[PDB]
């Protein structure tokens, strides 16, 4: 009731159990005024939002109705890599049931998408993605309970002949960006706010596009990062979300009006094609053009809630026992991507660590583009980037590295097993930039 806003259908746990059969299938859909056949979970783009509480059991049966093998990555979930298995392959026409328990202290916005090496980027770009929300007791404090809540899945697209556009040679180098910059599968929707305080869960599910988010005339109050709450709200004028990252922000609408949520120009180091121009700057692509993501209409006589004065304290982490160095490098013309000089080999274990210890990881981008580093299974705390302190304390699972930047991460190793780490420009992952961590 009231004004409608496009948002994925929500499937909720009941009595402590979320049991759901989800088919991955080609799906004709309406999109941006046309019809296209996408690859979808549950017949929708984005896929359905799964909403659970801590200690819930999830029993998701993935039914592969695609022409190719696939699997699922439960991005950001600290569960067993025997469940979240990057090496599993579900052949066409077969099913696989993922069963896990939500950890007791987890909260925030997570997501699921394909992770079959070599085919991640076409499958993700074709529409296979959805959100997972873990509710928290903190959602009951009045300063968040009475906020108007929405999920915003940021995902661009390009169509050719009624289907996802094919990957080009330039796409394997740069990562593929599309011309349709969508929110919850819609082109520039309008959100008619009914409350003056909004709580927006933000998910960058794009293959490679960055979103330098800014709301006209308003700051954002960051309350959650990828994997959990901040310790207290952090006011920002703008918020960069790299591929795979999530955030939750509060918006405090002071005045009536219509305000644009935009993705401001950002230069992630993508390389352009040659032949020569008239001026000076034409090898690098340069900054993205600004994009309007949605229109936000404030309610009448808006009086926003006060901000919560605290959120969730971040646990002391023990002293680290090992330091690791992971150097990212690129060969742009061959479109091959390396960690410590090697490309991914699923038969090769690159790092061996101990369960129940903390390590420091130093991840160094010795390339010229931004690379957003993701580690499965083990959330981390970003200490510093470029030798300077990270602006907040919260669990992250993707950290963006600009050219030459070195991130120092505190990585508590939880579950035993073999998992991966990789760039979340998924084309780069497909083309080399992935390694294997084994915890014992
Ligand atoms: Cu992911
Ligand atoms: Cu990369």
* 3-class secondary-structure state, position 57: strand
Structural contact between residues 413 and 355, judged by C-beta atoms closer than 8 angstroms: yes
Residues surrounding ion ligand 1 at CB below 5 Å: 75, 244
- Structure tokens belonging to residue 259: 């305000």
Q: How far is CA 161 from the centre of its chain?
A: 28
How far is 326 from 344, CA to CA, in rounded Å?
13
Q: Is 113 exposed, middle or buried (0-12, 13-18, 19+ CB in 10 A)?
A: buried
Q: Which helix (H) or strand (E) holds 174?
A: helix 169-174
CA-CA distance, 370 to 169, in Å (whole number)?
19
Phi, psi of 369 (to 5 degrees): -100, 160
DSSP state of 14: B
Under a CB-based contact definition with an 8 Å cutoff, are residues 406 and 363 in contact? yes
Q: Say how many Å lie between the CA of residue 203 and the centre of ligand 1.
A: 10
**Token pair of 400, please?**
């963006």
Rounded (10°) CA dihedral 265, 270, 273, 279: 50
Radius of gyration of the chain (CA): 21
CA 175 to centroid of ligand 2, rounded, Å: 8
Residues 6 or more apart in contact with residue 228 via CB below 8 angstroms: 106, 107, 108, 312, 379, 394, 395
**Are the C-beta atoms of residues 394 and 213 closer than 8 Å to each other?**
no
73 is in an annotated binding site: yes
Where does 170-215 show beta strands of DSSP type E?
A: 180-183, 186-187, 190-192, 197-204, 211-215
Reference 141, options 255, 312, 260, 386; nearest CA is 312
Question: From CA 378, how far away is CA 94, in angstroms rounded?
Answer: 29
Using what technique was this structure determined?
A: X-ray
Spatial CA neighbour of 8 closest among 181, 144, 127, 158: 127
Q: How far apart are CA 378 and CA 72, in angstroms?
A: 17
Q: Output the CA 341–ligand 1 centroid distance in Å.
A: 23
Cα separation values, 321 from 42, 324, 344, 408, Å: 44, 10, 26, 14
The H or E element spanning position 111 is strand 108-113
Q: 434: part of which helix (H) or strand (E)?
A: strand 434-439
CA distances from 218 to 13, 236, 305, 354, 406 (A): 35, 9, 15, 45, 31
Name the residue with tokens 């026992």: 321
CB atoms within 10 A of CB 53: 18
Tokens of 43: 């017949």
- Evaluate the CA torsion angle 334, 122, 175, 379 in order and state its sign: negative
150 annotated as ligand-binding:
no
User: What is the rounded distance in angstroms from the CA atom of residue 23 to the CA atom of residue 381?
Assistant: 35
Q: Which ligand is nearest to the CA of 111?
A: 1
CA distance linking residue 219 with residue 254, whole number of Å: 11
Q: Which of 25, 21, 48 lies closest to 38 in space, CA to CA?
A: 25
- CA neighbours closer than 13 Å in the CB half-sphere of residue 221: 21
Q: How far is residue 18 CA from its own chain's centroid?
A: 22
Q: What is the DSSP letter of 70?
A: B
Closest C-alpha among 67, 9, 31, 68 to residue 163: 31
Q: Is the peptide bond before 46 cis (omega within 30 degrees of 0)?
A: yes
Which value in Å is the resolution of this experimental model? 1.7
Q: How far is the CA of 8 from the centre of ligand 1 (A)?
A: 18
Give the distance between the most distant pair of CA atoms in the chain. 66
């Amino acid at each position: 009731g009231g004004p409608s806003f496009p948002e994925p259908k929500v499937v909720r746990s009941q009595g402590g159990l979320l049991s759901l059969k989800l088919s991955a299938t080609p799906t004709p859909l309406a999109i941006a005024g046309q019809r296209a056949t996408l690859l979808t979970y549950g017949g929708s783009f984005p896929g359905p939002t799964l909403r659970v509480r801590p200690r819930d059991t999830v029993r998701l049966t993935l039914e592969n109705r695609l022409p190719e093998p696939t699997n699922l990555h439960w991005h950001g979930l600290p569960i067993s890599p025997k469940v979240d298995d990057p090496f599993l392959e579900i052949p066409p026409g077969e099913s696989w049931t993922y069963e896990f328990t939500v950890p007791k202290e987890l909260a925030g916005t997570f997501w699921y998408h394909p992770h079959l090496h070599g085919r991640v980027a076409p499958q993700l770009f074709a529409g296979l993605l959805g959100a997972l929300v873990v509710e928290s007791s903190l959602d009951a404090i009045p300063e968040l309970r009475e906020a108007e809540e929405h999920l915003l899945v940021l995902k661009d697209l390009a169509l050719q002949g009624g289907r996802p556009a094919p990957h080009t040679p330039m796409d394997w180098m740069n990562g593929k960006e599309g011309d349709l910059v969508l929110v919850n599968g819609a082109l520039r929707p309008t959100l008619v706010a009914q409350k003056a305080t909004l709580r927006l869960r933000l998910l960058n599910a794009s293959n490679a596009r960055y979103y330098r988010l800014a709301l006209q005339d308003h700051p954002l109050y960051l309350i959650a990062a990828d994997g959990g709450f901040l310790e207290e709200p952090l006011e920002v004028s703008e918020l960069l979300l790299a591929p795979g990252e999530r955030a939750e922000v509060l918006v405090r609408l002071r005045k009536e009006g219509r305000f644009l949520l935009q993705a401001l120009p950002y230069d992630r180091g993508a390389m352009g094609m040659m032949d020569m121009g008239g001026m000076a700057h034409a090898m690098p692509q340069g900054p993205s053009r600004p994009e309007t993501l949605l229109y936000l209409i404030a309610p009448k006589n808006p009086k926003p809630l006060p901000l919560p004065k605290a959120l969730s304290p971040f646990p002391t982490l023990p002293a680290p026992v090992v330091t690791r160095r992971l150097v990212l490098t690129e060969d742009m013309m061959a479109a091959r991507f390396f960690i410590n000089g090697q490309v991914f080999d699923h038969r090769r274990v690159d790092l061996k660590g101990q369960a129940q210890t903390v390590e420091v990881w130093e991840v160094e981008n010795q390339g010229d583009m931004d690379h957003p580093f993701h580690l499965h299974v083990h959330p981390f705390q970003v200490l510093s980037v470029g030798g300077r302190p990270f602006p907040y304390r919260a669990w992250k699972d993707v950290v963006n590295l600009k050219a030459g930047e070195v991130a120092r991460l505190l990585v508590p190793l939880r579950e035993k097993g073999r998992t991966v780490f990789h760039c979340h420009i998924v084309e780069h992952e497909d083309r080399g930039m992935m390694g294997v961590l084994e915890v014992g």
